[PDB]
Design a protein around this ligand. Structure first.
Ligand SMILES: O=C(O)c1c(CCCOc2cccc3ccccc23)c2cccc3c2n1CCC[S@]3=O
Length: 153
């Protein structure tokens, strides 16, 4: 859904691509870029931590998923939604979702399937924005995300 979707995709795509390669995208963001930059910095901090602390569970999940190609990415929606929509809603779960997205993006890079990353990012965004739309809006979106993880300074 429009601006929230566009911003969300921009953030999630840049994070996954950045994580898969070692490259930081210089191209401009768009309509709320300052916030998106802060969200991206926040992701570098918190998302990387989530990947280290959960590497075993993540490895298990990647293993069960058996992702080899773009069709495998395109068929993830139902598991993704099933795991994500269960339980409580908080920013930590959104971080887990995106962070596993990065874990997968690195795997895709490893097996020379870089082209799958952008569809992956799209799928995650679709899931996030459809399942949590009203909550995300109530939390002031990515502004709420940056504030939630703001490190007192
Ligand atoms: O919703 C969650 O808390 C969750 C998530 C986030 C929601 C489901 O996320 C996905 C589920 C399936 C495929 C995914 C592909 C790209 C990004 C996220 C995907 C999660 C992701 C990977 C591994 C686990 C994940 N969990 C549970 C915590 C331990 S582990 O079972």
């Amino acid at each position: 859904g429009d601006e929230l979707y566009r911003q969300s995709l921009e953030i999630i795509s840049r994070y996954l691509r950045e994580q898969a390669t070692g490259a930081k995208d210089t191209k401009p963001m768009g309509r709320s870029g300052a916030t998106s930059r802060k969200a991206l910095e926040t992701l570098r901090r918190v998302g990387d931590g989530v990947q280290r602390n959960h590497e075993t569970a993540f490895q298990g999940m990647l293993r069960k998923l058996d992702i080899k190609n773009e069709d495998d990415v395109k068929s993830l929606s139902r598991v993704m939604i099933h795991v994500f929509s269960d339980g409580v809603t908080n920013w930590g779960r959104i971080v887990t979702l995106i962070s596993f997205g990065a874990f997968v993006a690195k795997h895709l890079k490893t097996i020379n399937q870089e082209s799958c990353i952008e569809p992956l990012a799209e799928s995650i965004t679709d899931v996030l924005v459809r399942t949590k739309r009203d909550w995300l809006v109530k939390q002031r979106g990515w502004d709420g995300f940056v504030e939630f993880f703001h490190v007192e300074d």
